[PDB]
Amino acid sequence: SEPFYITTAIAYPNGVPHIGHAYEYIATDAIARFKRLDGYDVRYLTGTDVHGQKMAETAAKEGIPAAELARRNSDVFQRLQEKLNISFDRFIRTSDADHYEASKAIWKRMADAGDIYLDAYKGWYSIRDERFFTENETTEQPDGTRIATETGAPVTWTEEQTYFFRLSAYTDRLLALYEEHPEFIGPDARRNEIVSFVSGGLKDLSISRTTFDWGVPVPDHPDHVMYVWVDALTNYLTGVGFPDTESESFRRYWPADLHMIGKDIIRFHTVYWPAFLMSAGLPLPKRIFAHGWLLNRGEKMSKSIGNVVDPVNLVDTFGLDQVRYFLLREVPFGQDGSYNEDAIIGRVNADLANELGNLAQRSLSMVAKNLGAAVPDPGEFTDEDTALLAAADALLERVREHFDVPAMHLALEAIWSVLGAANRYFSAQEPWVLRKSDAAEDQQRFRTVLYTTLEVVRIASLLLQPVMPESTAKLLDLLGQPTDERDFSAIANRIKPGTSLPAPSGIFPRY
Numbered sequence: 001s002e003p004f005y006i007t008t009a010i011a012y013p014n015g016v017p018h019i020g021h022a023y024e025y026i027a028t029d030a031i032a033r034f035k036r037l038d039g040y041d042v043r044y045l046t047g048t049d050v051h052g053q054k055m056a057e058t059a060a061k062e063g064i065p066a067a068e069l070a071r072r073n074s075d076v077f078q079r080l081q082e083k084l085n086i087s088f089d090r091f092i093r094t095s096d097a098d099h100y101e102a103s104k105a106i107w108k109r110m111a112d113a114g115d116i117y118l119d120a121y122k123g124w125y126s127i128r129d130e131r132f133f134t135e136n137e138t139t140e141q142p143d144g145t146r147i148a149t150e151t152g153a154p155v156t157w158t159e160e161q162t163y164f165f166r167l168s169a170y171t172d173r174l175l176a177l178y179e180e181h182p183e184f185i186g187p188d189a190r191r192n193e194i195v196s197f198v199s200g201g202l203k204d205l206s207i208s209r210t211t212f213d214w215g216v217p218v219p220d221h222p223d224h225v226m227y228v229w230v231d232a233l234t235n236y237l238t239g240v241g242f243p244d245t246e247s248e249s250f251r252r253y254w255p256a257d258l259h260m261i262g263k264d265i266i267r268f269h270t271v272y273w274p275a276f277l278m279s280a281g282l283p284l285p286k287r288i289f290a291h292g293w294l295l296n297r298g299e300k301m302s303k304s305i306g307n308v309v310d311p312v313n314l315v316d317t318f319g320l321d322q323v324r325y326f327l328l329r330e331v332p333f334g335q336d337g338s339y340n341e342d343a344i345i346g347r348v349n350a351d352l353a354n355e356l357g358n359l360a361q362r363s364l365s366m367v368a369k370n371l372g373a374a375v376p377d378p379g380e381f382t383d384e385d386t387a388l389l390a391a392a393d394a395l396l397e398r399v400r401e402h403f404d405v406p407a408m409h410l411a412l413e414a415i416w417s418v419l420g421a422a423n424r425y426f427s428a429q430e431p432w433v434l435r436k437s438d439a440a441e442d443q444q445r446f447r448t449v450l451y452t453t454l455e456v457v458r459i460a461s462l463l464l465q466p467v468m469p470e471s472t473a474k475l476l477d478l479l480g481q482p483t484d485e486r487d488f489s490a491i492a493n494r495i496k497p498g499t500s501l502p503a504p505s506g507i508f509p510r511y
Ligand SMILES: Nc1ncnc2c1ncn2[C@@H]1O[C@H](CO)[C@@H](O)[C@H]1O
Pocket: 009, 010, 011, 012, 019, 020, 021, 023, 024, 260, 261, 262, 263, 264, 265, 292, 293, 294, 295
């Protein structure tokens, strides 16, 4: 059992969670679930990033303390992930006691390494982005305001005596990392952008603040709070037992195999983060993958369904596994994408209700009515039977490779390509004609076709468990699959003839 440590970015709980958050959580959950079913020892971390000016300002506007806003809104984020059936091992919050100790410890490591110094900082700060910008990185608007050119967010002039991390000292070491380990950043286009950014030279990074107290206090300097990002990035270490490096959780899980993030926070994870760990003397994560941005087309409010960007509303309207499948099928993972109401309906009704649902229902109903509610004993397999089964048998290896990218969309496309072949096979064989035939050869052929169909459905159902946990669980129940035989290793074992099957019913209803 090889360890596999996967994480998501921890969101600022400044407002309600939206479709973008849900997109990242489900995508990561699918990989974490896949690895569990593939025989890995998985730890899966997610949570919230509660400190910073952005959070403090939101709290002040609402008229409640920052700690109150942080706790209340984080509860909403956790409840969403529980509703999305996310199999996280820990929901971390940067307000956690062990995270305070971890943050103080990594700061100490970097200071002891000689990479932290006190100097005067002058520059522009984007509160919305929690990010520093130079004078040349800003644009003086015709109305007199100053914004950050890249993001469009308003910037505030800042003059503070802060602590600095020696990022300028790590430029070439970071460049060597990208060259020697190209897998460190994914997809490829994102790595090229990071290489280009670092090649322009790096300046030292301000890592403390003096003008507010909503954050982790700097050890021995209570007048300073840690830059929200240094604090935030350390959560990946806290979730495995840091600063207890001798603990068994830290020994087996660190370094992380995959950091799942969006492309708006790539530089924090691929430039600052590895530099922090180099300074601290800690091994680096194996891979950072930046997924694309998902956005709603048309109006936010729909006359029929309501809030289209609200993940809770989408789940209640279409069903959890319907939403989970749509997000991972509609957009090529890593790329930017868009969606509307009709795109979801079209995907629910065609792919799930008809392609998978109807194929499973038509086959299982013929078993329960015409074959005594038991898996039929097959006869001799024809060239058409074999060609379909071979295509279904080839999936596990294909899908495994897609999940390692990660590219869940291509894994789903490969499965549905086989499901398409299974539907064409079912239609060409005409089992509804064979069941009524008096001839003995046709009655045996009827048994083989149904066995061949049920085996393909079984393989597909086992493979789709990471994407649609509950719907596949029900579909495997109807196929008479034992509870302990549902890992990917069971795909090699053909469905047993004579196995008793429960009364079948539709699992993927039409919208
Ligand atoms: N609209 C969106 N589409 C895709 N990802 C998003 C969106 N909004 C936030 N995220 C992601 O959620 C994570 C936590 O805020 C970040 O990695 C960020 O990239």
